[PDB]
UniProtKB/Swiss-Prot annotation:
Gene symbol of the encoding locus: PRKACA
Catalyzed chemical reaction(s): L-seryl-[protein] + ATP = O-phospho-L-seryl-[protein] + ADP + H(+); L-threonyl-[protein] + ATP = O-phospho-L-threonyl-[protein] + ADP + H(+)
Natural source organism: Cricetulus griseus
Regulation: Allosterically activated by various compounds, including ATP. Activated by cAMP; the nucleotide acts as a dynamic and allosteric activator by coupling the two lobes of apo PKA, enhancing the enzyme dynamics synchronously and priming it for catalysis.
Example of a GO biological process term: regulation of osteoblast differentiation
Tissues expressed in: Ubiquitously expressed in mammalian tissues.
Keyword Nucleus part of the UniProt annotation: yes
Residue numbers carrying Phosphotyrosine: 319
Name of the protein: cAMP-dependent protein kinase catalytic subunit alpha
């Protein structure tokens, strides 16, 4: 255990140094060629770009400052960039550059051509338990790392997990990640993945990430999430009820772990007890997991995505290609001074 303790102490030291003195303004837009839109949202988009001098490909997240303000995401976007530039773990995507202009904020990250877990899971239908367990182990270690830094992730779902060339996970999208000691209160995240204490407007803590892991494991192994309905309010009723139904093909060990992660009483939920993450790591469902070998990326992956090279976009979907407009006048300068 001393080995883990010393690893996490060094991790916190290195995170805090970058957290206290964040990088800023480390590239500009005209250093890149635009290739393709990879995803779109209410206040931004993600683009495949190529750096004109090195030839390297990157995923560039572009946020419209005016829409960020309207949709009340200012603090969240400042969190996202400050955290991402400060972390370092094998299963977290690396932020390579950031900058802003009159209209937009930009985060330039490593490009992962294998695509999102969401697409692979819907294509295959459901993952076997070994396959789901390989991914789950990476999330457990990633949350052990993040939580030790007093970070809550708050957006675990298959769309945010990219599959790399070795078949390992890269967590992307830190839009709701926050540094907090103790409780926080914001309603955010995707309905199917919300813990009961979020739905009920409580002051909640890192236990919500462990709940979301239970939802993820269930969805990976079943092919659909445990709480599903046409309207968010119907989903929320199922989440708070304390009732889940398991497919008969689930192993007994999987059901037992899920009852302890999908525990409605946050004071009894695995990951939030006196024994912390070890209640999860030592559970029978993980008995075949060599935690060190997973961290070192020495385990042969269940699945290697098919792709032709570092610029291949075949595992991403097609979107309308819209302009990236940069106003002649500065927008929202004060709000985003620290970015």
């Amino acid at each position: 255990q001393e080995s883990v303790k010393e690893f996490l102490a060094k991790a916190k030291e290195e995170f805090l140094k970058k957290w206290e003195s964040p990088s800023q303004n480390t590239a500009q837009l005209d250093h890149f060629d635009r290739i393709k839109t990879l995803g779109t949202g209410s206040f931004g988009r993600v683009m495949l770009v190529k750096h004109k001098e090195t030839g390297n490909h990157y995923a560039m997240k572009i946020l419209d400052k005016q829409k960020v303000v309207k949709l009340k995401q200012i603090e969240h976007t400042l969190n996202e960039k400050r955290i991402l530039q400060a972390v370092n773990f094998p299963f977290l995507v690396k932020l390579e550059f950031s900058f802003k202009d009159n209209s937009n904020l930009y985060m330039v990250m490593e490009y992962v051509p294998g695509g999102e877990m969401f697409s692979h899971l819907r294509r295959i239908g459901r993952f076997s338990e070994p396959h789901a367990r390989f991914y789950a182990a990476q999330i457990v270690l990633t949350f052990e790392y993040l939580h030790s830094l007093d970070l809550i992730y708050r957006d675990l779902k298959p769309e945010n997990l990219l599959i790399d060339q070795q078949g390992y996970i890269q967590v992307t999208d830190f839009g709701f990640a926050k540094r907090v000691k103790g409780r926080t209160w914001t309603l955010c995240g995707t309905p199917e993945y919300l813990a009961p204490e979020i739905i009920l407007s409580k002051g909640y803590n890192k236990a919500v990430d462990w709940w979301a892991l239970g939802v993820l494991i269930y969805e990976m192994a079943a092919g659909y999430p445990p709480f599903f309905a046409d309207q968010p309010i119907q989903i929320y009723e199922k989440i708070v009820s304390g009732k889940v139904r398991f497919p008969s093909h689930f192993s007994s060990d999987l059901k037992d772990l899920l009852r302890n992660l999908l525990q409605v009483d946050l004071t009894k939920r695995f990951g939030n007890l006196k024994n912390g993450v070890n209640d999860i790591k030592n559970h029978k469902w993980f008995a075949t997991t060599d935690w060190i070998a997973i961290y070192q990326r020495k385990v042969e992956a269940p699945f290697i995505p098919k792709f032709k090279g570092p610029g291949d976009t075949s595992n991403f979907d097609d979107y309308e290609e819209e302009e990236i407009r940069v106003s002649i006048n500065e927008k929202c300068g004060k709000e985003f001074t620290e970015f």
